[PDB]
Point group: D3
Chain length 322, copies 6
């Protein structure tokens, strides 16, 4: 197995690129301090918004956007290389397409300083969020101790289909980085557990400590076992390092060995006792509709919130904010 | 609103058609007594295996199988008409195709005594259960108090895609009837909550009190709100009637009005704020595979349990256990 | 003893006087139904904003304000006389001084239909609430079963000095009516307990089920014993009636008999065992300051929120929002 | 921020001045052992009665009384200087006025070995306690990491007015030392939380492990955040060191920045939206009465426990015990 | 099944035979009211000291002692016959041997008004209680719904051997009536569970609401299943009626059918699988000693409390306290 | 006091003597790693089945059986000597009598490498277990920090008479080693607490992490105080080391000093206030029957499970498995 660490990082108010640089250096010191304090740690996870903070007046400006990769990711890579750990980082990424809004991005860097996974938030916390819908799917990569890692961001964790997709591609440790998991805290705890159980995989999840120079007790850290049991739940303190031992091969072995608990197999092989191989047609219209690009809820023509003019967003198209 | 009752029904050991008829009369008496005790109740729900019990040496025999509809469902129909309630019942159903095993079936009968929903368990609990995988999809019907009801059976409730399917078809009250959910108890409670939250719908779930003539404290009754909160959690007693008031239109209104919480809408309309209208393709390979009937986990090759041979079931198909 | 009921009343969105009259009829129907359902009940308590709702765009308009007493309170009076109960009601009250904003008012009406207590919210919830600070002090009246009742409103319950004041005037059952206490939920539960314990009195507290036509699971009902123990904690359901038996004389007897636990006596008689009779001056500067109208925190100079300007309220005084 | 430590100190039976000296040396070793084990600790807190034990047959004798300052406090000071920590100590203090009973005293010593705060219990746990009512008010001092410290003793923590007084004078970390917080344990936990929330400050509280050479599991350690959440609650073990990180400036910033949660400001500025500056008259009779030295409860002429002859104390005056 | 009720009865301070007669009438009224309120109830249980209270200055006087049977038990008998219930009552019983102290006695009266069980407290709560150790063993009687009832009193329930004895004689519902179990509350709850589990029987336990004219929230009501699970745990209210359905035959069936769980059988038949029939001698020295009347703890020589001298009781034997 | 450690040891599938040797070496490394990580630890406890695993196809074979003492115990002794700790080990012991089935054995080894306690499971978890009923009684030995140690195995902990026997012989720290304490987990937690309280002693209890190369989250570690409070409850992780400080002399002092709580003394001295010395006859038939070898339950002639032919065991006699 391996030791994982989820950092309840407190980000101060960010007003300039100068503040962004100090923030990056704070993350780096924290990474090193964590390896020093926990000599066995192999994976260190930082929360959503931890690089550039949460300044909604500036976060679409060019000063506030970074490239992935870029000079800042190289600094993170250098840190991961020196500390010899896998690290997970949150970056609001300048869209290579200058016409489009930036992405909300997560990267995993390995102990060699290589970016081995790049994920762009697939379901931007709408209507509040300006981030462009991610186009890299749900990737999975090799991690420490036999792990296959995947990451989702904030609201993404509320979508069980995304956890399934990760697992379907081999993920056995599903990471969630968040930056507003209070006031809907119960549902965050709930889905971290269900994402684990549904797919027989570990979940490791972290929330930002805070962002406003005042309150820094919004942080969360949760590790769930592949049976959905919460193995570790951090107390909520700024700078809290939530740690636990993970055994990816145990999740693998449960997937290989289990019968009654093997729901992920059952999904595509229902009733395999009565019908050799199981029924491969799950019998679900929404799956077929979603595959065909025609998912439509029966009540869609009667909805209220469907565009972001309740705070201020152009939803016809174009580019805005910069 | 409407008042729902979930019955923690105890079934004796079932050795004969005589015992099955006894269960039927006992269920009917319980139905009437519940209506008498709770004059406002509009929906009364009985657990999986409450009609025929769980005699695994006999459960595939003709003596132990019923037709749906048949004389027995007509008895249940008569009871629902007399009490003027909706009732949910479990029947192991003779397969009209004599080359296939029986189904594990649930019905909802209305206060007119008409069967308004027939559901055949899509995900038999394997490798222990020999039931043929269901072929009626996940139907939804009109229920009391503005509800759109759907029923799943036991193990079905572990599959989040199935809860999504019910919701997709309009369900705002998702019923789960269970027979031996204990020892998977934590995961049963968990998924009852996540099924509700993921889909912004109520869940109402019940487990059989027991089945072995000895222990009858396996019963469960759980009502979850559309935010995933457990509203009512039954005490575990044989014959316990777990009740709660349900407001289906409140769930409907959440679905029409909520933004960030509206995960079910977001699934099919990714980022309507940044992308015009939102993207309708996340790039989920498993959805495309499942839709196409080719869902295949990367590790299927090394799995230990892919038929019923561990329980001595034949592995080649056809009707068995007669 | 006497039986108390706290009603988790749901209020629709209120757009008109028509809707207000609807709430009034709904409250009256609920009052009668509660008496019918609980024939022994002697005190029925409705939440803050249950009469007029929480339309912040309209709540300061003449259409949305009532007189106390007026035709509407006479309707409530008639209901209490008919049901033979004490009732607690919330009314946003037109200020007779046209140069001042309306009050946030609570009344208790007796089983004779007489208003026996009128309280104007001493601590409006700022900066969001525009209500004029109350000018009737913290009154106490005779209630059922040997009780001396007092009512505070919402935010008022966060001020321990106010609970002390009610006790000081004889209160042994302290009622708190609330309208949007959620998100301050932990602190609401906490202070309901501390208000009871600090003063050796019961507390009975209720929160509105909801107010926005969508979510009605914000309701709370809490009854605390005079030792601070929560005796009854409601489930959160719209329309839930939270009930409990209260024994006011037991609190009186604790106040007369207890030694170490008698903190309320000790406050004004410090050390009667060492000093003859006890010292009546602890040297509490804030008490002397507050009494003199000069309470001033050392950090007031640097405070960010000291008027309603954040919500766009005028800062110079007088009547606004008409 | 800074690390605090609350020591669940077990005191053996104390029969002589010789025992008192051994006890002092035990406290000192514990202080040093704590700094060694927790290199970052800046504040180490010892419980009530930890210096002289709890021998109610001898505790009024001259052999058992110490001066503050005196040779024993100099030993504590020397320890705090060598370890470079702030320390909090409990001393039963000989009254400089030989006519009067001794005080129950707490001191805070800084890393320079200076006594920077001296507090005498204001509300002696009557009727059991012989200690003279304190005459030093509720002082506040500068502590580590931007803290302003204040201390109360045992029953004092049950009086919210004392927590308010500390806060009013700038306290942002309120310390409570106790020596009998079992059997009324719930109320201790409760008030540590409410004292924190009511005033937007941290509370750090400790109870003596035991005193009778037999049972040493009465110890408690509790750290509460300024929102009233218990951040750390020790398990109850003798010698248990309960630690946590405290961020005084965060409490300060909440006091500066918050609106809805700013109850301490509201107390003296009620309804400041409707009335510029708020109403400075809180409308509370007991505050005015207490300021004028005429606090009188309505039921005072009917009370039982008002003097300490239920165990044995002369309440007319004079000196006794020595 | 049968429905049981445990009454959290409050007793006033008892100063006279007049007060005792008052308690008797109050108990009888409560018995009838319980039957009226719960028409299905077949067993109604009152706490220890509910007849005579807990006046320790008077409790050994002739005025405070009753005969069993006597005129007072005949009153209780009449009530049980009229209500057609089984009732459990507590009576401090005059010892027919004038050279011995009175007994602490419990009776069960049947729906015919016959005393069918008389039990004298085997383990008086020492050193506080002066009752003569009981001499009727642990009797068992036929109760409602296939039950075999046994009663123990207060402190008795702390002795697992006594619960074993009741079971050994056939008991499947073990009743415990208590008078001041608080402050031993955790251990009372604990042993109610272990007594059930150890012996595969239900336990039904009640504690007096209070006894001192001031505090009446000491009441407890607890029903445990034969697996040790708490089925019902009362709220603490004076007059609270704690009810639950009990299925004695289910316990009987567990005892007949269970293997690994059948600890009560295993105790007397060690290893029937390896040794033919099982060994009937574990080599338990304390059992042999206790049987022989020579149970002696290795440390008895150094024990501090072995008589009632701490409470001022005489230590030489005979009748006292008259 | 002293520090104890309970090791949630994960044992892999064991197929040969070669696997047994690797397992022994794993235990030894774990012992050393534990002393290194916890320099103050004096007692390190390994769970049932940790030496030879749980291979029910091979565990009766000569290859799988060890002698006590033997070369393997000498390796454990050498480890305990080098690490200077007391260790507790589980060994399936070859019966010196070749006619009889092997024993399920636990040993305690001291810091000198001497086996100071040897216990053979007295009540073999029947009917599943082949182990011969133990013949060494319930021994007690001197341990670290003033402790008197005793051990029981798995199901033995469900028998309160065995805990009593240990205590009766001086035990003040009662150890339980288990290897299947899930699915009856509640009852394990329950009895660890009751065994402690009933006898005024500490309990320290551990369960095997797992055994099947798949699932290793069955582990448990629980330390209970002599009042029955759980002081430490481990999270369930493979390799988890559950530690706590134990103070045996405190248990001793409670046994010497306590009155109301002294149930272990009361057992053999009931009602000692009324009757000098107490009544030495406990009044219990089962105690006398058990001492005389004639323990017989009233329902014994109607039982089902009484021999192990439900899995496959010759219960007439002889030798089988090898």
């Amino acid at each position: 197995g391996f030791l994982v660490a989820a950092i309840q990082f407190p980000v101060p108010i960010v007003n300039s690129r100068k503040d962004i640089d100090h923030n990056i250096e704070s993350i780096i010191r924290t990474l090193h301090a964590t390896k020093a304090g926990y000599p066995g740690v192999e994976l260190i996870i930082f929360p959503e918004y931890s690089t550039q903070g949460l300044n909604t007046a500036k976060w679409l400006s060019e000063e506030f956007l970074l490239d992935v990769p870029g000079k800042e990711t190289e600094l993170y890579a250098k840190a991961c290389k020196e500390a010899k750990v896998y690290g997970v980082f949150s970056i609001m990424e300048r869209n290579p397409d200058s016409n489009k809004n930036p992405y909300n991005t997560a990267i995993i860097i390995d102990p060699q300083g290589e970016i081995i996974l790049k994920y762009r938030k697939l379901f931007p916390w709408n209507p509040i969020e300006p981030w462009y819908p991610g186009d890299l799917g749900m990737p999975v990569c090799e991690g420490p101790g036999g792990s296959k890692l995947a990451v989702c961001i904030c609201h993404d964790g509320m979508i069980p289909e995304l956890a399934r997709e990760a697992a379907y591609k081999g993920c056995n440790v599903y990471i969630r980085i968040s930056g507003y998991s209070t006031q809907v805290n119960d549902q965050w705890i709930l889905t971290n557990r269900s994402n684990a159980w549904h797919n027989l995989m570990y979940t490791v999840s972290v929330n930002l400590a805070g962002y406003d120079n005042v309150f820094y007790y919004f942080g969360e850290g949760q590790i769930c076992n592949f049976d959905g049991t919460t193995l570790v739940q951090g107390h909520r303190n700024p700078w809290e390092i939530v740690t636990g031992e993970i055994y990816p091969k145990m999740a693998d072995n449960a997937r290989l060995s289990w019968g009654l608990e093997n729901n992920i197999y059952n999904l595509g092989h229902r009733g395999y006792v009565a019908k050799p191989g199981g029924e491969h047609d799950a019998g679900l219209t929404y799956i077929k509709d979603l595959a065909a690009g025609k998912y439509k809820l029966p009540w869609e023509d009667h909805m209220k919130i469907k565009d972001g003019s309740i705070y201020g967003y152009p939803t016809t198209g174009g580019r805005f904010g910069k």
